[PDB]
Amino acid sequence: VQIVYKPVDLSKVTSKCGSLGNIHHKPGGGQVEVKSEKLDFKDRVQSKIGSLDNITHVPGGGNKKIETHKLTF
Amino acid sequence: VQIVYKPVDLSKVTSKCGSLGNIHHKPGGGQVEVKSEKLDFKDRVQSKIGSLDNITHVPGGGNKKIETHKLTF
Amino acid sequence: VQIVYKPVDLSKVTSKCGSLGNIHHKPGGGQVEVKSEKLDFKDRVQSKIGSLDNITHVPGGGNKKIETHKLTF
């Protein structure tokens, strides 16, 4: 038995952008009010209140190549 | 048995953009109000209130190539 | 037995754009109010209130090429 696993990759993933800007992300400009009375809890509580984990992601590229090679015998 | 696994790739994934911008994302500009009275929780509680996990994602390319090669004998 | 697995790819996935912009996303501009009185929860609880998980995705390309090569003997 002979196996010759010989894939050839000459690909490209490319971008050109002339200018990139004037990006505004303003999450949670509005008021938040939370009121609690006579609450009972008897197992774990997780609470997040306000502006949390908001992302502004502005790469000049952001291009991806994902390549997977597998052989099983 | 002979196997010659010889795929060849000269592909391109390409973008050209002249300008990218004037992007406005404003989650949660409105008021949020939560009032809780006499509530009873006998198991785990998770709570999120306000403006959370919002994304502005503005890549100058954002092009993707996904390429899987598999052999099983 | 001989197998010669030799696919050849010279394909292009291409985009050209003059300008990309003036994009406005304003989720949750309206008021949210949540009164809650005498509720019993004998069970796990998850709650989300306000403006969550909103996305403004604005790639200058955003082109995709997905490619799978498979051989089973």
Residue numbers in the entry:
A (entry chain C), B (entry chain A), C (entry chain E): 306 to 378
What does the paper say about this structure?
Residues 297–391 (using the numbering of the longest human brain tau isoform) constitute the proteolytically stable core of paired helical filaments (PHFs) from the brains of individuals with Alzheimer’s disease. Here we use time-resolved cryogenic electron microscopy to study the in vitro assembly of recombinant truncated tau (amino acid residues 297–391) into paired helical filaments of Alzheimer’s disease or into filaments of chronic traumatic encephalopathy. At later time points, the first intermediate amyloid disappears and we observe many different intermediate amyloid filaments, with structures that depend on the reaction conditions. At the end of both assembly reactions, most intermediate amyloids disappear and filaments with the same ordered cores as those from human brains remain.
